[PDB]
Design a protein around this ligand. Structure first.
Ligand SMILES: Nc1nc2c(ncn2[C@@H]2O[C@H](COP(=O)(O)OP(=O)(O)O)[C@@H](O)[C@H]2O)c(=O)[nH]1
Ligand code: ALF
Ligand SMILES: [Mg+2]
Lengths: 177, 324, 327
């Protein structure tokens, strides 16, 4: 039983890194890649041998009408934004949601908060303080997921691999319903 | 929402066989020429003979060639006075005179030196076989119809239904005079059939007589190939009039007109091989092949084979490129 | 503590160049699954009666794309691995060829309608006869993705390879050009909804530009969206989107008179043909800086087009000229 997962988000918000960690079980070897060609992976939730297909939208983000070609017959959307960038939390209800629910009506959405490890890191706190912003707390991300109405809000990091498996475990079980 | 049609431009210097292609593509894929259709051309066969003769008659004077048989001085006057646009019968004050002039070794001497003035290519074909034409019961043979010469000044388009696919074959002018108009039929062009007359290598342009006829066929080619609406359209080079080169290359030598050619003399092939090389090298885009074929446009059965093979390539392309 | 980071520019950039080169391969063979797997098998076995009239509409021009990549572009990326300075000049070189992505992108919505409705009970069969892990509708997105991943890979060469030379000018155009191609492809989707125009929009050359104008003529005032291609300019009625044809003027008979009776915002475009009559449309613009832009560009398209003609009538002269431009 195959299903179709398309990912969506702003540029360099850890879309491509998140899929590499799952499809390999390893960090990219200290060269952060760019192209993750469409990977059918063998996941197993609630005892159901799902073969969920993964589609990256890496780069196709300044082109309004071209993304719509990746959306038909879709069963789940891993919409996401970077924790280290409140400007990526801004586009979730602004650009993405309104676009998504048109090309995929009543079809589920999983909000994900990438690179949780970069919340604690001091080098990304002093960098953000310049812009008069701060790392998005979890009690802001949940309220966003509710507001847009996602299947379930999750957080992870491509460096830690933490919550990466559990996000796809949610992405799989969501693809069922 | 079907799209079963395909435009093709025929292009090139004048007198290179663009119209003659259209005649063969008619012979092959169209309705042939009937007897009534041929009888239309007699006026033009008749005309061409005068065009050609008057051409030389004037060449005699221009190049101070002397007539061998005094009695031809008259004959040459009489003929040169004739209005070719009104001539529509080959009757005997003249039929004898043109026969006598053709026979004078002086006129032939002039004809042997034809390079130096504008005489047509089917002059021999006709003036040798006068007696047949001059017959009062003449009716042009398909070959005669293939070898006549009614010069084009107008873009006349000729469609041809062929295996459920239409090829719309455009026939353009040739002299510098006409080439402006060409751009109005550059519209949805699928492929550029470009003709070069292999036997042009030794002549000069009719319109401007300082400039080698290949030098210009060459210039024109690179000029069209460059033009940026033809980058999404294949190019097929038909080096025509091979039969003429094959006979011509025995006297008039290539290397005297193109010194870059380091091959042998009187070698029919070695020449055309080199001439082809000139043109194919002017191909700019290195990701695109530039198909070639040596043709004789007055040889129906050679042309049948060429266009046969050309299609199976043209179709092959435009299928992959989703134009069908 | 300076030049030891200048050499770190190379290695880091070679990893990005080698990704392109090694992804260009997996892409070639992934198109090779489409072309010589699904299309080859379907040609040998036979065409289904439900899908007989629409065999081609599924695979678009994908065969043209494959054979370009395989037999020329890939091979040149391999030359770029052992000569990375040669790369930027190569992406400029073939701006025109990438037109084939436009024809494919526009004919993609049609695949889904010809696949997802007609033969999904048929592509299951071929998928299990060939035996691929990836279902047909996955492999037919490859180019759509690939063309918008060229902007990315080159953009990453620009970060890391800024230090390894100041020919960011060769790579400036190289990146510019490789964003415009996905722009055309993106724009040519909306303009695919142009109803009531005979002629293929695709093969009317580049879509240079478009803007809104008020269109008089001796008067009949009307707000219209004016598309401008290299071969043609179309006048169209906007439907707030999606458009309708109203008038055209092919560049082959175009004429222009700018700054009409003094006004920066007004110009006229004229169609004078060999067989047709004489039409004349007065375009008045919103922003004066949009009017002036158009004059300049159309007055140019013409300037060079009237060069071409003069060179047809005098071709040897004009190729002496161009041979000394080259050298
Ligand atoms: N002997 C010979 N004559 C040819 C050949 N091709 C064309 N001709 C003749 O040369 C003249 C020019 O042909 P045409 O098609 O009208 O030239 P165009 O101006 O390019 O269209 C005609 O009278 C033909 O009979 C050829 O291959 N061999
Ligand atoms: F010189 Al022509 F038709 F091109 F007579
Ligand atoms: Mg002709």
């Amino acid at each position: 039983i195959r299903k179709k997962l398309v990912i969506v988000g702003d540029g360099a918000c850890g879309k491509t890194c998140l899929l590499i960690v799952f499809s390999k079980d390893q960090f990219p070897e200290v060269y952060v890649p760019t192209v993750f060609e469409n990977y059918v992976a063998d996941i197993e939730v609630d005892g159901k041998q799902v073969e969920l297909a993964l589609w990256d939208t890496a780069g196709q983000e300044d082109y309004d009408r071209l993304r719509p070609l990746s959306y038909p017959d879709t069963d789940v959307i891993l919409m996401c934004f970077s924790i280290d960038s409140p400007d990526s939390l801004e586009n979730i209800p602004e650009k993405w949601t309104p676009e998504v629910k048109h090309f995929c009506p009543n079809v589920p959405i999983i909000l994900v908060g990438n690179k949780k490890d970069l919340r604690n890191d001091e080098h990304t706190r002093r960098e953000l303080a310049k812009m008069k912003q701060e790392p998005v707390k979890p009690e802001e991300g949940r309220d966003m997921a509710n507001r847009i109405g996602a299947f379930g809000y999750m957080e992870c990091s491509a460096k830690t691999k933490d919550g990466v498996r559990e996000v796809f475990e949610m992405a799989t079980r969501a693809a069922l319903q | 929402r079907s799209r079963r049609e395909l435009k093709l431009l025929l292009l090139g210097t004048g007198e290179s066989g663009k119209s003659t292609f259209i005649k063969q593509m008619r012979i092959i894929h169209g309705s042939g020429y009937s007897d009534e259709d041929k009888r239309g051309f007699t006026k033009l066969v008749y005309q061409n003979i005068f065009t050609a003769m008057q051409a030389m008659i004037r060449a005699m004077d221009t190049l101070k060639i002397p007539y061998k048989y005094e009695h031809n001085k008259a004959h040459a006057q009489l003929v040169r006075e004739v209005d070719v646009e009104k001539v529509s019968a080959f009757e005997n004050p003249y039929v004898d005179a043109i026969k006598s002039l053709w026979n004078d070794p002086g006129i032939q001497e002039c004809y042997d030196r034809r390079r130096e003035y504008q005489l047509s290519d089917s002059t021999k074909y006709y003036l040798n076989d006068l007696d047949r034409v001059a017959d009062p019961s003449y009716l042009p043979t398909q070959q005669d119809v293939l070898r006549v010469r009614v010069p084009t000044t107008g873009i006349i388009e000729y469609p041809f239904d062929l295996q459920s696919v239409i090829f719309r074959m455009v026939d353009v002018g040739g002299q510098r005079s006409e080439r402006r108009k060409w751009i109005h039929c550059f519209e949805n062009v699928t492929s550029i059939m470009f003709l070069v007359a292999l036997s042009e290598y030794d002549q000069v342009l009719v319109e401007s007589d300082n400039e080698n006829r290949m030098e210009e066929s060459k210039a024109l080619f690179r000029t069209i190939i460059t033009y940026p609406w033809f980058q999404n359209s294949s190019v097929i080079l038909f080096l025509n009039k091979k039969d003429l080169l094959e006979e011509k290359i025995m006297y008039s030598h290539l290397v005297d007109y193109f010194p870059e050619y380091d091959g042998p003399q009187r070698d029919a092939q070695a020449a055309r091989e080199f001439i082809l090389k000139m043109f194919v090298d002017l191909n700019p885009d290195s990701d695109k092949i530039i198909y070639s074929h040596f043709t004789c446009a007055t040889d129906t059965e050679n042309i049948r084979f060429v266009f046969a093979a050309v299609k199976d390539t043209i179709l092959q392309l435009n299928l992959k490129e989703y134009n069908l | 503590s300076e030049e030891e980071q200048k050499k770190k520019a190379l290695e880091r950039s070679m990893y990005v160049l080698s990704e392109l080169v090694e992804t260009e391969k997996m892409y070639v063979d992934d198109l090779g699954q489409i072309v010589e797997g699904y299309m080859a098998t379907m040609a040998a076995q036979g065409v289904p009666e439900s899908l007989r009239g629409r065999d081609r509409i599924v695979f678009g021009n994908i065969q043209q794309i494959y054979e370009w990549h395989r037999d020329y572009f890939l091979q040149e990326l391999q030359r770029c691995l052992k000569d990375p300075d040669w790369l930027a000049q190569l992406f400029i070189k073939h701006e025109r060829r990438l037109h084939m992505y436009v024809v494919y992108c526009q004919n993609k919505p049609k695949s889904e309608h010809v696949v997802s409705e007609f033969g999904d009970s048929y592509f299951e069969e071929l998928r299990q006869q060939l035996g691929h892990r990836l279902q047909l509708n996955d492999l037919l997105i490859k180019p759509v993705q690939r063309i918008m991943k060229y902007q990315l890979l080159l953009k990453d060469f620009l970060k890391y390879y800024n230090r390894a030379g100041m020919d960011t000018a060769d790579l400036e155009q190289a990146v510019e050009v490789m964003c415009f191609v996905p722009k055309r492809c993106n724009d040519m989707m909306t303009l695919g909804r142009l109803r009531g125009f005979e002629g293929k929009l695709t093969a009317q050359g580049k879509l240079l530009g478009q803007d809104t104008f008020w269109v008089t003529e001796p008067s009949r005032g009307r707000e219209r969206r004016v598309f401008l291609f290299e071969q043609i300019i179309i006048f169209s009625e906007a439907l707030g989107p999606g458009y309708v044809y109203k008038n055209s003027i092919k560049v082959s008979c175009l004429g222009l008179e700018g700054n009409l009776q003094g006004d920066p915002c007004r110009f006229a475009l004229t169609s004078r043909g060999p067989e047709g009559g004489i039409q004349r449309y007065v375009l008045q613009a919103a922003d004066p800086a949009i009017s002036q832009a158009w004059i300049k560009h159309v007055a140019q398209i013409l300037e060079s087009q009237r060069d071409f003609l003069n060179a047809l009538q005098s071709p040897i002269e004009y190729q002496r000229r161009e041979s000394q431009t080259n050298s």
